[PDB]
Amino acid sequence: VANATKVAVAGASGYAGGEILRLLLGHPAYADGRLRIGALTAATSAGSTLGEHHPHLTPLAHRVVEPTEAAVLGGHDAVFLALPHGHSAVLAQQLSPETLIIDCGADFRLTDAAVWERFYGSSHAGSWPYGLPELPGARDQLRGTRRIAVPGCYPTAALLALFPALAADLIEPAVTVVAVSGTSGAGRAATTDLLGAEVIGSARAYNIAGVHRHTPEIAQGLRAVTDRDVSVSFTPVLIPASRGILATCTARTRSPLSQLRAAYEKAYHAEPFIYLMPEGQLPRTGAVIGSNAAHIAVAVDEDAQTFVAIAAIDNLVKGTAGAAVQSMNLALGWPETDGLSVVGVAP
Ligand SMILES: NC(=O)c1ccc[n+]([C@@H]2O[C@H](COP(=O)([O-])OP(=O)(O)OC[C@H]3O[C@@H](n4cnc5c(N)ncnc54)[C@H](OP(=O)(O)O)[C@@H]3O)[C@@H](O)[C@H]2O)c1
């Protein structure tokens, strides 16, 4: 059990960095003095105050953003990396080795070098314990870890929706995922196609037909629960919301619905963040915003011989920062649910 942890956040001015800070402010270790918020770093934002970026985080508004450098990041027991991929290997190498390093990007997520290279165009750096505690065998690798690779947002929703059925061998291993997402998932770098005037009142699929980099990440998590050949058709759709992922996940099945439901019960009955919808209810992203919860319902389309699983998460909490803090709690030997509410902020 960690006694006193001074935390830095690299990429503090971005959405993921902002959300880590929000959750750390609400964490009971912050309140009782055991967790201390240190250096807040970025690139070009350095020299500005945090309030200029995250006006919702008023207790920290006056903090001056510092450059993202080893000298600034030194002397922290834990360092969150909330930066675009391709910096954390370089950066992680510069930090004291015993630092708990929690990487929100993709660099340490994937376990196959040829898959990595294909989708990311660089040499594979390797892999770190995957920050999705609810996956079979995941929680054990996170306890006492000094290294965490936080999952992508879409794979979190897809894996939670699909792994129990596939693990029980109750569906075919060719899965289809169509997931809608709020725009905060795309980050805070200004581009035309993320402007409000463009996104408000409009929906669009993007990176379709296997080009999205989260495709192999879904396939990897699934391959860990079955011996069968997994395929993934993944289509992300940007919708006019700031937060939220609703993943619609399908696969061929000939199994009774009651057996599929039993597989979800077994997987999730004692998982505090997973909420199985009551009969006749279905998830909505509105219900999970600002919580670390995933709300899940499953069904069978008999005419179509198709299993349907719906999963809703907050992309910034269970999809990113909440996953990071949940995994942090595990790494430090603190109660896993600390700082992480299952109650949504709705309407
Ligand atoms: N947002 C999500 O829903 C989500 C979900 C899953 C994973 N992630 C991951 O989180 C990471 C950041 O995403 P985001 O959505 O939070 O992006 P973002 O909102 O654009 O913020 C990016 C942050 O990184 C900083 N940065 C950029 N280049 C840097 C550099 N060369 N050195 C140091 N800092 C640099 C920026 O600083 P400046 O302000 O100075 O530019 C900013 O603080 C990505 O790897 C992404 O894959 C995000």
301 bridge partner residues: 306
Q: Which two tokens stand for residue 261?
A: 């439901």
∠ CA 338-269-160, nearest 5°, is 75
Residue 249 φ then ψ, to 5°: -125, 125
Q: Which two tokens stand for residue 118?
A: 């294909």
Residues at CB less than 6 angstroms from ligand 1? 11-17, 42-45, 68, 82-85, 87, 104-106, 152-153, 184-185, 187-189, 315-316, 319-320
For CA atoms 126, 129, 131, 132, give the dihedral sign.
positive
Residue 278 lies in a domain: yes
146 and 222 part of one domain: no
Among 219, 218, 216, 222, CA closest to 169: 222
Residue 310 lies in a domain: yes
- Nearest-atom number in ligand 1 for the CA of 186 is 15
Q: Which two tokens stand for residue 52?
A: 């200029």
For CA atoms 326, 329, 105, 214, give the dihedral sign.
negative
Residue 179, phi-psi category: left (phi > 0), alpha (psi -120 to 50), beta (remainder): beta
187 and 145 part of one domain: no
71 and 118 part of one domain: yes
CATH number at residue 96: 3.40.50.720
CATH number at residue 158: 3.30.360.10
User: What does DSSP assign to residue 318?
Assistant: I
Residue 342 lies in a domain: no
- Nearest-atom number in ligand 1 for the CA of 185 is 3
Is 95 within 8 Å of 74 (Cβ atoms)? yes
29 and 156 part of one domain: no
Please tell me the distance between residue 96's alpha carbon and the centre of ligand 1 in angstroms: 22
Residue 343 lies in a domain: no
Please tell me the distance between residue 47's alpha carbon and the centre of ligand 1 in angstroms: 17
What is the number of domains present in the chain?
Answer: 2
179 bridge partner residues: 236, 247
- The approach used to solve this structure was X-ray
192 and 136 part of one domain: no
User: What is the Rg, in whole angstroms, of the alpha carbon atoms belonging to the chain?
Assistant: 20
Q: Give, using CA atoms, the residue closest to atom 32 of ligand 1.
A: 43
Residue 339 lies in a domain: no
136 and 179 part of one domain: no
Longest Cα separation, the chain: 62
Q: Give, using CA atoms, the residue closest to atom 21 of ligand 1.
A: 14
168 and 114 part of one domain: no
Ligand 1 binding pocket mutation candidate from 91, 104, 119, 313 (most atoms within 8 A of CB): 104
- Nearest-atom number in ligand 1 for the CA of 53 is 39
304 and 325 part of one domain: no
Please tell me the distance between residue 133's alpha carbon and the centre of ligand 1 in angstroms: 23
Residue 38 lies in a domain: yes
Is 143 within 8 Å of 331 (Cβ atoms)? yes
Please tell me the distance between residue 135's alpha carbon and the centre of ligand 1 in angstroms: 25
71 and 139 part of one domain: yes
176 and 259 part of one domain: yes
Give the span between the Cα atoms of 59 and 270, in whole angstroms: 35
Give the span between the Cα atoms of 4 and 332, in whole angstroms: 10
329 and 256 part of one domain: no
Residue 84 lies in a domain: yes
Residues with catalytic annotation? 153
24 and 88 part of one domain: yes
∠ CA 156-164-334, nearest 5°, is 55
Ligand 1 binding pocket mutation candidate from 15, 102, 313 (most atoms within 8 A of CB): 15
Give the span between the Cα atoms of 317 and 264, in whole angstroms: 22
Residue 224 lies in a domain: yes
Please tell me the distance between residue 85's alpha carbon and the centre of ligand 1 in angstroms: 8
Is 257 within 8 Å of 300 (Cβ atoms)? yes
Q: Which helix (H) or strand (E) holds 197?
A: helix 196-199
Please tell me the distance between residue 80's alpha carbon and the centre of ligand 1 in angstroms: 11
Please tell me the distance between residue 15's alpha carbon and the centre of ligand 1 in angstroms: 7
Resolution (A): 1.9
- Nearest-atom number in ligand 1 for the CA of 152 is 6
CA 139 vs. chain centroid, Å, equals 15
Is 252 within 8 Å of 277 (Cβ atoms)? no
Q: In terms of residue numbers, what domain contains 210?
A: 151-315
Ligand 1 binding pocket mutation candidate from 41, 49, 83 (most atoms within 8 A of CB): 83
Is 259 within 8 Å of 168 (Cβ atoms)? yes
Q: Give, using CA atoms, the residue closest to atom 1 of ligand 1.
A: 185
